[PDB]
Design a protein around this ligand. Structure first.
Ligand SMILES: [Zn+2]
Lengths: 75, 164
């Protein structure tokens, strides 16, 4: 299925994924499309901050869904 | 009334800057003093606070605050920013606080985002106390600490002295 990922600059990436795919998989795909290291990626879905362990299924991310890509900040 | 210029709180360089930022937001809300009343607490890189930690904490304490990524949420009274590696916070003085949606808090909201007025009795009573009880935990646990406190708060006025 297709999902969309929106960067902070308002770019829209289109990904091919399965509901089974883990958040880590999605990050790896984003890297392949954008050259953003997973190390510094955080994915948001309707405000809910996604976590590496879980799948798209677990977060209810279906076809056509839009995620927001955010840069990890530590201070 | 329209105002100009930027009003910023920069925490000390103790290693707890993010938590000081939240503390200061609440300290201004409650007492008009835009600064941290938390006692300084030293820690290294591996106990720094993330945008994840700060977002969770903002939601627990129910603050009119966003973490600014790129666009600042127009409805956020308090703007949290990572300045290099130092968490700082700006405040919009001439503006009533607004209760922010989650996307607004996280700072991934879109042009047109809406938020209703923050209720006067809107800051959880003992929010600042909850943060004070929690902040010296590992940063990835601080929000859990706050949530636990607020959910089941110690009722005794001098509970800290009791616990000693
Ligand atoms: Zn917003």
């Amino acid at each position: 299925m297709q999902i969309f990922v929106k960067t902070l600059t308002g770019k829209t990436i289109t990904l091919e994924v399965e509901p089974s795919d883990t958040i880590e998989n999605v990050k790896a795909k984003i890297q392949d499309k954008e050259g953003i290291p997973p190390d510094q990626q955080r994915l948001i879905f309707a405000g809910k901050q996604l976590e590496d362990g879980r799948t798209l299924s677990d977060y209810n991310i279906q076809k056509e869904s839009t995620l927001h890509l955010v840069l990890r900040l530590r201070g | 009334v329209p105002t100009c210029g930027i009003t910023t709180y920069s925490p000390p360089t103790d290693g707890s800057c993010g938590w000081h930022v939240l503390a200061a937001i609440m300290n201004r809300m409650i007492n008009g003093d835009f600064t941290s009343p938390l006692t300084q607490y030293n820690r290294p890189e591996d106990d720094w606070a993330s945008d994840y930690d700060l977002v969770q904490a903002i939601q627990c304490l129910q603050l009119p605050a966003t973490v600014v990524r790129n666009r600042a949420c127009p409805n956020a009274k308090y703007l949290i920013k990572l300045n290099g590696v130092h968490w700082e916070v700006e405040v919009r003085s001439g503006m009533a606080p607004r209760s922010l949606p989650r996307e607004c808090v996280v700072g991934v909201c879109s042009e047109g985002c809406v938020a209703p007025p923050y209720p006067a009795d809107g800051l959880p009573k003992r929010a600042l106390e909850a943060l004070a009880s929690a902040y010296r935990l590992p940063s990835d646990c601080v929000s859990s600490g706050i949530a636990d406190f607020l959910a089941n708060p110690p009722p005794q006025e001098f509970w800290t002295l009791d616990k000693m």
